[PDB]
Enzyme design. Sequence first.
Site, PDB file in Angstrom:
ATOM      1  CB  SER A  45      -0.961  -0.013   1.250  1.00 36.86           C
ATOM      2  OG  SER A  45      -1.790   1.196   1.028  1.00 36.86           O
ATOM      3  CG  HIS A  46       1.940   2.776   3.460  1.00 38.35           C
ATOM      4  ND1 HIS A  46       0.358   3.110   2.842  1.00 38.35           N
ATOM      5  CD2 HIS A  46       1.707   2.655   4.676  1.00 38.35           C
ATOM      6  CE1 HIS A  46      -0.157   3.110   4.078  1.00 38.35           C
ATOM      7  NE2 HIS A  46       0.338   2.554   5.014  1.00 38.35           N
ATOM      8  CG  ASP A  64      -4.212   2.904  -1.420  1.00 35.00           C
ATOM      9  OD1 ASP A  64      -4.063   2.291  -0.307  1.00 35.00           O
ATOM     10  OD2 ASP A  64      -3.254   3.346  -1.991  1.00 35.00           O
ATOM     11  CG  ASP A  83      -4.668  -1.709  -0.232  1.00 38.22           C
ATOM     12  OD1 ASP A  83      -4.751  -0.368  -0.460  1.00 38.22           O
ATOM     13  OD2 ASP A  83      -4.249  -2.067   0.937  1.00 38.22           O
ATOM     14  CG  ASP A 126      -5.908   0.718   1.923  1.00 34.79           C
ATOM     15  OD1 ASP A 126      -5.714   1.362   0.884  1.00 34.79           O
ATOM     16  OD2 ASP A 126      -4.890   0.619   2.810  1.00 34.79           O
ATOM     17  NE  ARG A 127      -3.561   4.439   2.394  1.00 33.37           N
ATOM     18  CZ  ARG A 127      -3.117   5.058   1.600  1.00 33.37           C
ATOM     19  NH1 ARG A 127      -3.863   6.319   0.887  1.00 33.37           N
ATOM     20  NH2 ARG A 127      -2.165   4.593   0.668  1.00 33.37           N
ATOM     21  CB  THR A 178      -1.299   6.531  13.992  1.00 34.31           C
ATOM     22  OG1 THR A 178      -0.330   6.384  14.737  1.00 34.31           O
ATOM     23  CG2 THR A 178      -1.362   8.200  14.014  1.00 34.31           C
ATOM     24  CD  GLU A 191      -5.897   5.540   9.820  1.00 35.63           C
ATOM     25  OE1 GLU A 191      -5.103   5.589   8.744  1.00 35.63           O
ATOM     26  OE2 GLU A 191      -5.556   4.512  10.425  1.00 35.63           O
ATOM     27  CB  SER A 232      -3.091   9.175   5.815  1.00 37.81           C
ATOM     28  OG  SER A 232      -3.172   8.050   6.440  1.00 37.81           O
ATOM     29  CE  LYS A 236      -7.507   3.590   6.808  1.00 34.91           C
ATOM     30  NZ  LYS A 236      -6.225   3.974   6.912  1.00 34.91           N
TER      31      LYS A 236
HETATM   32 MG   LIG Z   1      -3.670   0.929   1.162  1.00 36.43          MG
END
Ligand SMILES: [Mg+2]
Length: 565
Positions: free
Chosen positions: A94-95, A275, A277, A279-280, A346, A373, A375, A386
């Site tokens: 993800s990051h 995102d 994946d 998730d965001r 966090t 969040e 971010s 998420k």
């Molecule tokens: Mg992600």
Amino acid sequence: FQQPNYTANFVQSTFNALHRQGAVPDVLVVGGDGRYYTSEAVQVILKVSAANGVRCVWVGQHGLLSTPAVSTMVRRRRDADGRKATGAFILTASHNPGGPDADFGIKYNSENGGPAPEKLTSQIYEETVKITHIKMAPTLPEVDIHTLGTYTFDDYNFQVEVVDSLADYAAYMQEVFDFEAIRALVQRLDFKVHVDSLHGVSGPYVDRIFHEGLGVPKTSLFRTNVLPDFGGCHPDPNLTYAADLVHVMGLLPDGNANPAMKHISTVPSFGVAFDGDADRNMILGCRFFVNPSDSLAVLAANADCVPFFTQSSSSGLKAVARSMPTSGAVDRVAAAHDFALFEVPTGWKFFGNLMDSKDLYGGKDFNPLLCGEESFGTGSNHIREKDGIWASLFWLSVIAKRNAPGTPLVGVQQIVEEHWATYGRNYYSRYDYEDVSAEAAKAVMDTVENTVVDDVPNLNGVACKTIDNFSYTDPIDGSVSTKQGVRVLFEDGSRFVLRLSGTGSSGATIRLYLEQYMDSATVKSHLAEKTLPTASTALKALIGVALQVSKMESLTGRKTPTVIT
Ligand SMILES: [Mg+2]
């Protein structure tokens, strides 16, 4: 990039958490971030897992599975002889904006569908490094993950079922949202949409939901094919470079900005990106940027729109949680209503616990919870991850609950501005100072603590009080978390926060957060009557304070930040 012997040691590691002997009843789910790896590394997971002693494995079609769908499949999914998986391996970092030379990261989610607790994940650190011997033993199977069906094997009643990666996730969203009302919104004559998945695993889902589900034309959804980027594009939602979605709506990578796109009949009224994946997420309007925090709040205020929170004879909505680094615009929504708020640290764990109260571990029985969040991403209790695509459907339902057949409809900008008009606006912006000496970095941290600690009523503005280095005690498990941000609160609700983000020896990054309340210059009057001040200018005050206070310019040598949100 490289790491210890192969990567299977991780898979072996998570199994060295689950103590023997399971025998043959353990079922797990596999799938992860689109690309690049997975396929050739999925094989590895199966060989080792089968060599360990799991009965069955549900792999996602093509090896793809968005994180929110992962949690979904482990949560609500029972069929084919009727079985429930007690875990899952997710192949995402993800990051990670790239992945050349087969860069890799892996995640594990536990029986509650969500990520593994801190106890588990930290115990895997040991095994990943201390592993002295591995067990895979090629015999040698190599299943086809691109074809639906179950494959039964010998030596150990093993079976790999390649499952459709979209049906259950699309089914869930159809249950929790009034898709019929959303259809009325997008199948109208004055609503242009624009979804971008950045060639992320969210891609296919966007097609299956927005097109097949809602009915939006395919020409609105973009980059909805999974790929292994080499020369673009970054799967991280932001203002900069990923200004694609930003540009479409008509914005600059410098926040709400404007050049030569003011009056164009070809500007979509809704744009959203997801995102890597899924998730965001990042949600935008016709020339309007919605701060991830302002987004959370608006969903909370207008949560009476989705059946999920409405049906089940619930209380309407009794819950709301957010990371502390996030803006408190969701606090003001918890004031104008009666639902109990949480300002957690966090990390998702805390969200897990707060969610895990209705069906596990005492506490407050009802749990219709919302989470978010800074971010971005945000989510609820519907799954234990998420969810990006979920939020985008949420925002559709909200705009849908407006009734615009025939008559013109309120745009997102108004809705947020109306929301700004009802509860007042929480400005939010983040200053990053990258690549500073950890000496100076900590020096700034201590200075803002120490010098403010023993002089609470120092400085400018109103009575700046409640200054502290944020500590939090988990209400469900009783964990104690500390040094998760030097806060510097004001009276009205304003605050500026410094948080230190630095993993290992590579300098550090001063994370300076800025939040200034205002309920003036409004309300109910459409657009403060042309006196739109805007969040960026009025934050100059809080900036002037913060720097003076932290002696940040004097300690680091930084006049201007690296990044600004
Ligand atoms: Mg992600």
